[PDB]
Structures are given as structure tokens and as C-alpha cells.
Write a protein that binds this DNA or RNA. Structure first.
Ligand SMILES: [Ca+2]
Ligand SMILES: [Ca+2]
Ligand SMILES: [Ca+2]
Length: 272
DNA sequence: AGGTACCCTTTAAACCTACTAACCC
DNA sequence: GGTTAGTAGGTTTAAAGGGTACCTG
């Protein structure tokens, strides 16, 4: 387990949070995903050797670091292998807060305000706790290895196969392999950077999310990539089945209609 | 006051199709 | 002509993102 894959992953799916209740303040960071990939959590768990997994919620598993003193291992990991997403801003923010706690400054009705001003500029914002602290606040704060991208893709990627309805092809259809990786429109910073990292691939706008889409000859490049740094999780069946199509469709086998049958079969049994 | 854990709710991620364009020429 | 590609439209869940209560101090 490479130490960048972790950041690459946490950049894509981690969740640094500040909660407030009745005022009790506690910091959490958790990765939440489909139960089928509990083992990936377990891989990560054992890697940091801290935190815990449980069933939040249905057909899912959450993993969480909620002890103060275990969060330090995390924070220590993330400074040396910093993060590239706007999530960064959430860490810096999450981290400052952990400072305040490190000193016990948050037992003061004052520290308590220094923390909400942070919380207010976190993932979503102040909710019911807008009128409690209507004194406002705030001020939120280049790919790194390629193990980052393996991590980033293995969580925020999609390896799918395309059966177009070309009325022109003798089969009446086109097999094509696209690779996708979606992210918020606010991360234009990162998406544009994904393109330059490979010097190829399409950037597209949709529903306020952007997609980095990636020509066979390029499709093959990144195929080579995930030999050098592969995907991890259940999601690497989809890669392999995709990868498989990349062979049985790369010796002119995707043009015979005995083969398209074969492809759909493969495709049919992937993603779902 | 710090754990530790049973829950929850929407939405940004993943996943789909089907037509145009610009390609081997 | 036949194959590619770049595009427009989609659907749906697995995330992206939250809570508060319970022991033990
Ligand atoms: Ca994400
Ligand atoms: Ca994922
Ligand atoms: Ca470039």
C-alpha cells in the first residue's frame, strides 16, 4: 500500500468534519463507502493503524477517526503528502481546529467561536446554528506522484464500454472504451490539471460537475498506467473486464458481430 | 470532558445511450 | 464505406456530509 494512493483516495472520498451539539465540539474524518469495499477500508485502517469501521448506513460501511490522539497520525500523514483537491482547504481548516483543541482553548466560550468560524467554511456551512452563532466569522486557504492518480481514480473514476448505434457499421453498432472521472465544477483547478498530466483527454461540463473523459491510442496509454499504478478495490474488476475488451476489441474483434455479442456479455456484467 | 457508537439525509460522484463530426483517405 | 471519435442527453446510488446519545471521568 503506497502512501500517495491514500491521499489520492482521501482527496476523492475523505470527509473532514466539525460537528457542534447542545456547546460540545468534536472533529471527525471519515471515509464512507459501499459495503462491498469494506476491505479497502480495512487496508487503509491497518496502514494508519488507527480509526474504526462500522455499518453506516445500509449496504455501506463507514470508517472514522474520532479520538483526538489518533487524528494526529492522520494529520501527520497529510502534511508530508499534502492534498490537491479544494478538500485541501477543508484540511487546513480541520487542522487549525485540532490546534485549538490541542491547547484546550475550546473550553472557553471564545475558542468555541474560533471553531464555528471554521465550521462555517467547511463542507457545507452553519445550519439552527446560524441564529445560535449569528456573529459570523472563515477565509479558506499540481499532481504529485502518480500514485495519487491511481488513488484518485480508483475512487472517482469509471471504466465503461460503449455500444453506439451507428447505422453505418456492418454490425449496426460501435464498440468504444471511454474512461471517466467526475468531480465538482468548483474543482476546475484539478480537472484541467488532470488533462495536462497526460497531455490528452477531454474535459466536459455537465450538471455543475465536470468529467475528464479519455481515443484508443490514449485509452491504451492510461491502460499502461494502471500497470505501473493500478486501481484498487472491487473497482479493479471493472478495469480488468474493460482491459479485456481492450484486447478482444484491439485485434479487429469488436467489428465481427460474433464479438460484439461477446463484448456486451462482458459489459453487461460490469459496473451494474 | 472525552470517548465510542448506534443512526440519518440528500447530492456529487459513477454510470448509462445515442446521435453528429472528422477519420483511416 | 466504414470506422472512429467528440458530443448531447440521461438515471441513480454511493457516496459527500451529517448528527446526538451513552458511559466514564
Ligand atoms: Ca469526492
Ligand atoms: Ca467510489
Ligand atoms: Ca500538457
Amino acid at each position: 500500500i503506497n502512501p500517495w494512493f491514500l491521499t489520492g483516495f482521501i482527496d476523492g472520498e475523505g470527509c473532514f468534519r466539525i460537528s457542534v451539539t447542545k456547546w460540545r465540539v468534536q472533529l471527525f474524518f471519515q471515509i464512507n463507502l459501499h459495503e462491498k469495499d469494506r476491505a479497502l477500508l480495512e487496508s487503509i485502517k491497518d496502514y494508519l493503524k488507527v480509526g474504526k469501521i462500522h455499518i453506516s448506513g445500509k449496504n455501506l460501511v463507514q470508517y472514522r477517526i474520532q479520538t483526538f490522539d489518533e487524528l494526529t497520525i492522520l494529520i501527520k500523514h497529510l502534511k508530508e503528502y499534502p492534498l490537491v483537491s479544494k478538500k485541501r482547504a477543508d484540511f487546513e481548516l480541520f487542522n487549525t481546529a485540532h490546534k485549538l483543541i490541542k491547547n484546550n482553548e475550546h473550553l472557553n466560550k471564545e475558542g468555541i467561536n474560533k471553531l464555528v468560524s471554521l465550521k462555517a467554511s467547511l463542507n457545507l456551512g452553519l445550519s439552527s446554528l446560524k441564529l445560535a452563532f449569528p456573529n459570523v466569522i472563515a477565509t479558506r486557504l499540481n499532481i504529485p506522484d502518480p500514485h495519487w492518480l491511481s488513488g484518485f481514480a480508483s475512487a472517482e473514476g469509471c471504466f465503461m464500454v460503449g455500444i453506439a448505434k451507428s447505422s453505418a457499421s456492418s454490425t449496426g453498432y460501435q464498440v468504444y472504451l471511454t474512461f471517466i472521472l467526475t468531480q465538482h465544477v468548483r474543482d476546475e483547478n484539478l480537472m484541467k490539471c488532470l488533462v495536462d498530466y497526460f497531455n490528452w483527454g477531454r474535459l466536459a461540463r455537465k450538471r455543475n460537475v465536470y468529467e475528464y473523459q479519455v481515443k484508443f491510442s490514449d485509452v491504451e496509454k492510461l491502460l499502461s498506467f494502471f500497470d505501473k499504478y493500478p486501481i484498487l478495490g472491487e473497482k479493479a474488476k471493472d478495469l480488468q473486464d474493460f482491459c479485456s475488451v481492450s484486447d478482444l476489441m484491439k485485434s479487429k474483434t469488436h467489428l465481427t458481430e460474433e464479438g460484439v455479442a461477446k463484448i456486451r456479455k462482458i459489459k453487461e456484467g460490469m459496473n451494474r
